[PDB]
Design a protein around this nucleic acid. Structure first.
Lengths: 51, 51, 50, 170, 134, 124
RNA sequence: GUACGUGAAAUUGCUGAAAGGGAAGCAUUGGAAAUCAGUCUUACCUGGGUGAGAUCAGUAGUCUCUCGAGACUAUGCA
RNA sequence: UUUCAAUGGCCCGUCUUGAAACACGGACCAAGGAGUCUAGCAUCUAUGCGAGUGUUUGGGUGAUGAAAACCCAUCCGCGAAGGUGGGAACGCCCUUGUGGCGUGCACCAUCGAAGAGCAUAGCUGUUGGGACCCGAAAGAUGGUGAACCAUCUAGUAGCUGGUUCCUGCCGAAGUUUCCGGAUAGCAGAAACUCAGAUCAGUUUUAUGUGUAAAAUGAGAGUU
RNA sequence: UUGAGAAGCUCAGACGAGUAGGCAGGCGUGGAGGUUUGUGACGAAGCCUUGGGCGUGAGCCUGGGUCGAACAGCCUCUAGUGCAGAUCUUGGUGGAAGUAGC
RNA sequence: GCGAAACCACAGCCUGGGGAACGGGCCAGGCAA
RNA sequence: AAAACUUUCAGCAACGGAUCUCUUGGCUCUCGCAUCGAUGAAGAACGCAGCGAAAUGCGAUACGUAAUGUGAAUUG
């Protein structure tokens, strides 16, 4: 019910409502992003422990 | 697959209740974004009208 | 160390935001009064007739 | 706000260390030279002493009026004129700081900038002239002894028709 | 050539992700072989029957001991044989009829992830394949 | 890593100057006997992968920033931590009302706005 | 302004510009004229004084959470 | 951006032709405009189940579109009807490495005599259907005053003209051979087994120009 | 050392003609379910323009002028989806030409 | 005064050679107002 | 070499009616129902309005009457 791997394989690749498709990089609209980009280390939804 | 045995029932007033339900076995089944897509893809063409 | 690294950067980058918000408020920066396409046209036509 | 906000890749240790410059043999101090570029191009100037890159040089104020100035060795033609003793003048006081351009300093209150009522003048300080007058007092006596040298510095370098700089050594 | 599965079973792209690390960070050929076969098409991965597995471990001199049979692909049962022997099996998929038959009388069934945490180097595992001709 | 381009001029279509029914959008000439397709002298060039720019410089404005299109004021906030590499391009249909909200917010955030003076007017 | 929403291209007339020995045409390299790109010392650090505030009180209360973590209300500004 | 200066560059598409020569088609601009829809077959891949498989003929049901979704009764379709060595992988070692001892999958050799489908979706291919688009006198039926009209008709084509965005990789053959073809070959695409193995529009050595056995290189061979 | 969109990041070397043809990744149009708590009378779509940019390119973003009511980015679904030709269909418009001439 | 249709890739000095016509474009030439 | 003429580019005005937005229309599928005429149908012609250009409506009881309603408008 709580897996960083399956959650990422959906949000990271199928569809996440916060991703902005840039020209070089993807940006994340999620308010809890420490970087503002769409990454695997950055994304607030996949990472189960976050700050 | 180990996750969250019990769920809590909320009354009308919004306060939690002491009763609880074991998380159903369905709530651990595989999560497949590709298989849901290629089934929703099909099942959504079933209320179509011909032109 | 990656996770603590990114939080410190954000704290650094948020403080610079708060600083810049303060200094801009101090300075008497100009307002930005926008431009309307209907009033601009109507005044352009009414003038020519005048 | 000191913890580096971004990745900010730092410059790798560059393996370049500054070494002393090597000047031309004829650029030894006390050599008449043909200034090439600058507002005082074409005059003839003796070399007081060398510097890091340039040559601290001055022409006789009482003859040519060339002040002590850094002139890059590349913009100087090394003339084979008979060398002039320059050992007398104190060349040690001539440094980069002495020839440094005045720092962009002297802030003004934000009312005098308007109406243009704060303009100073950087007019040459007397000790700068007094430094040169001492240099003249130590080089003007030197130069008159060599015949025609005083007039030679007075004259202005130029090329006539059919002048080949390579053929006629300066 | 083949270095990315054509599949879109998201969990097979997690199984490969585990055996891409194992293959390149261990010196065993079991991992390099397992990873290759996780890339193969559905046609190239034949079903391997329970009876065929039962014959292979209990073959010739028998002496099955407690070796674990590993196959990338399904393990369909064989109702044509009544007494199934004790078996430890790892596979991508089982059939509910087969998995019950292994569980009811004998050992246990495993997925490729439970084998890896037990024998990451392929320690004492039989790697079988089904009949390709079909 | 400075912003250097392998070519400035655009690739125009062959014979696109002569005709007006022929658009200037680059179309590959597939003519069998086409000498201009055959790379003769005095002809025009043709897009090749050899013309790509530095991968650390692709999409980069001449001042080094990569344009980033911000629709509303929410978008200008996420450029908080990439203000040194991205520049907040304001969408063309964003009204003059929210256009000031975007520019004033971006000024304090520290990010660079590319079209900060459109449809608006200053007042002292 | 009823030849009436937007009013594209072809096409034609007027004006301004440069050019104009049987073509034109485009491509490179510039020049010239004409015109736009974008400008920014300013902030940082340090020193003191002056009044402050609070996430600080050898301090007092309430609210939601989970002792202390928040949002505040007094009170003093060490 | 216009213009000039110096260097340059034979009109595009089709077809023809090695190539051109050509002969065509092109007064200009806008819009419209041509591998599509479907049944059958085979292939590759993806998914669900797996000795099974397939709810949608139909019935049950669905209060918020109820032509959806959800559920399953009786059939039915398609399936179902042993040794030897080489071998993948593994263990035991043990002079370790080297290798041996083994256990030996898929499969291949040998001696011989422990089922893998079904259904859906896609891709490419093929056969029909108006069948990529346009173009050959028709003919027939039935009417109107030899003529003319309307439909059957999407009648017929090996032929003619046309068949629409970008980049990247690989890239022939252009012809043997038998005989309109089946071969082959070239190019691929997959599956295999090996570099401690074989090779070469190769060259030597030498035996009688061929053949056989050294160098120079390249991993080579299959289905 | 932060460089886990492991579909990422990084390192090294060689290489780059191309028809028939084979393979792959993309750009664009109409509409469809999801989404951007998206844009819009403080001006949507469109249009022109020697404004500025982005991409090898298909294409894209933006400034100004007109304009006046709608529209779009992203993930998938889908098809009457991309033109320079077809003596192509339709409409428009020239030279020929103030000519043949009446 | 009233006013077409045909036609139209675009043009239009030749001299020669330019191998496949090449002259209607290419190079040597003159001409070129 | 300027004008004239020829040429390109820009401004402006014509010309043309694309594009964009919609839309009391088309097409497609499903659904319910059973109803013409010798008691003169379908069709046609001629008429008819305080005035109609088409267009509908109507039949010398003519852009309709009776009756049941609604309840104050027709509208150039």
């Amino acid at each position: 019910m709580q897996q960083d791997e399956v959650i990422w394989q959906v949000v990271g690749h199928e569809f996440c409502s916060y991703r902005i498709k840039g020209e070089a990089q993807n940006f994340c609209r999620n308010e809890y992003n420490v970087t503002g980009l769409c990454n695997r280390q950055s994304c607030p939804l996949a990472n189960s422990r976050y700050a | 697959a180990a996750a969250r045995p019990t769920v809590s029932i909320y009354n009308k007033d919004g306060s939690v209740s002491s009763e609880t339900l074991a998380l159903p076995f369905v709530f651990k089944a595989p999560i497949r974004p590709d298989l849901v897509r290629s089934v929703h893809t099909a099942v959504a063409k079933n209320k179509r009208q011909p032109y | 160390g990656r996770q603590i690294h990114r939080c410190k950067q954000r704290l650094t980058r948020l403080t610079q935001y708060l600083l810049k918000a303060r200094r801009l408020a101090l300075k008497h920066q100009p307002a930005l009064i926008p431009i309307k396409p209907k009033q601009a046209h109507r005044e352009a036509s009414r003038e020519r007739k005048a | 706000k000191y913890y580096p906000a971004y990745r900010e890749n730092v410059p790798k240790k560059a393996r370049k260390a500054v070494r002393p410059t090597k000047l031309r043999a004829s650029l030894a101090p006390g050599t008449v030279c043909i200034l090439l570029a600058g507002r005082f191009r074409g005059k003839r100037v003796v070399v007081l002493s060398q510097l890091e890159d340039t040559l601290v040089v001055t022409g006789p104020y009482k003859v040519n009026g060339v002040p002590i100035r850094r002139v890059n060795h590349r913009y100087v033609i090394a003339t084979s004129a008979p060398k002039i003793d320059v050992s007398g003048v104190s060349v040690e006081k001539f440094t980069k700081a002495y020839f440094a351009k005045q720092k962009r300093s002297g802030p003004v209150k934000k009312d005098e900038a308007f109406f243009a009522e704060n303009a100073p003048k950087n007019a040459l300080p007397a000790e700068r002239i007094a430094d040169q007058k001492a240099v003249d007092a130590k080089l003007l006596p030197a130069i008159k002894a060599i015949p025609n040298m005083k007039e030679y510095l007075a004259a202005s370098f130029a090329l006539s028709n059919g002048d080949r700089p390579h053929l006629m050594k300066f | 050539q083949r270095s990315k599965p054509a599949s879109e079973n998201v969990y097979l792209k997690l199984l490969v992700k585990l055996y891409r690390f194992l293959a390149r960070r261990t010196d065993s050929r079991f991992n390099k072989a397992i990873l290759k076969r996780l890339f193969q098409s559905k046609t190239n991965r034949p079903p391997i029957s329970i009876s065929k597995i039962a014959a292979l471990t209990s073959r010739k001199s028998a002496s099955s001991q407690n070796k674990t049979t590993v196959v990338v692909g399904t393990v369909t049962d064989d109702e044509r044989m009544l007494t199934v022997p004790k078996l430890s099996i790892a596979a991508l998929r089982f059939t509910k009829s087969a998995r019950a038959r292994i569980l009811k009388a004998g050992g246990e069934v495993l997925t490729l992830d439970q084998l890896a945490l037990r024998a990451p180097t392929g320690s004492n595992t039989v790697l079988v394949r089904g009949k390709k001709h079909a | 890593v400075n912003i250097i381009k392998k070519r400035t001029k655009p690739f125009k279509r062959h014979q696109s100057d002569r005709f007006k029914r022929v658009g200037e959008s680059w179309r590959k000439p597939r003519g069998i006997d086409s000498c201009v397709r055959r790379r003769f002298r005095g002809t025009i060039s043709m897009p090749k992968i050899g013309y790509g720019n530095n991968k650390k410089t692709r999409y980069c404005m001449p001042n080094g920033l990569k344009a980033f299109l911000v629709r509303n004021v929410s978008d200008v906030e996420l450029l908080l931590m990439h203000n040194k590499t991205y520049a907040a391009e304001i969408a063309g249909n964003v009204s003059a009302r929210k256009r000031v909200e975007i520019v004033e917010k971006a000024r304090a955030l520290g990010v660079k706005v590319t079209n900060a003076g459109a449809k608006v007017r200053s007042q002292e």
